[PDB]
Amino acid sequence: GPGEALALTEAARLFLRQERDARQRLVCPAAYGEPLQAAASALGAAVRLHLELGQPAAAAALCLELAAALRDLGQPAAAAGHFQRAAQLQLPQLPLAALQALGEAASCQLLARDYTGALAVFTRMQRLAREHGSHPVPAALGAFSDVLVRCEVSRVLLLLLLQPPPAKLLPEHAQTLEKYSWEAFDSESSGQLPEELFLLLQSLVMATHEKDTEAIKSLQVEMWPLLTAEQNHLLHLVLQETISPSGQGV
């Protein structure tokens, strides 16, 4: 019967409370993850059970619980995988729930320093949010419009951090980066973004090409109140990589 999934998720909540007691509440150095192996096994069984019952939206909820536990327990590279499993299980039936789960995957990739993985997930989000939430039946609906603003700002900062070469530089990236220039149009180009944030992102994409380091320092303090903490971290990484590059070893 279906009540086996309730027994397995209540058992997993007990094991995850034991792991939270050991790793977060007591902060025991002697912990080695045996309660978490048990939690991942009971939620794995309940996920497969919900899938053979044809309840993929219920399986996705159990993927989100494990992903949240892994993130809270200091394993963000693992949590990103289960957040993407949840998004994949939700997407054909709940597109906005899938965008929530991809947003948590991208946050987990940024914690794991997996910047190219984060760039790909935000690009998938910006594609899906235009596909499912930006139609006349054109401007985005309010819930999807908030996802579009998140992706745009984050992708611009990730592209300024990573600076991909030709053919890694997708049409989706070239097209985003084209908007962050000006030439011939004054006598509304801000799109989904607040106009103050758009002018500072325009200025940042220009100051980074010019390597205008004192302009990037100026823009970083001006943008600080306007960004999320995750986005202020991304902007710090852009300024850091500009003053002292990676891959040089010295």
């Binding site: 600076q163 070469p165 030709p166 530089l169 070239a174 980066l177 090409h209 010019e210």
Partner: peptide, 17 residues
């Protein structure tokens, strides 16, 4: 007098300088 370079869009190149 700055432009984007043909072989890499993140490289600037110079015409009036």
């Amino acid at each position: 007098x700055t432009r984007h370079w043909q072989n890499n869009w993140w490289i600037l190149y110079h015409e009036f300088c």
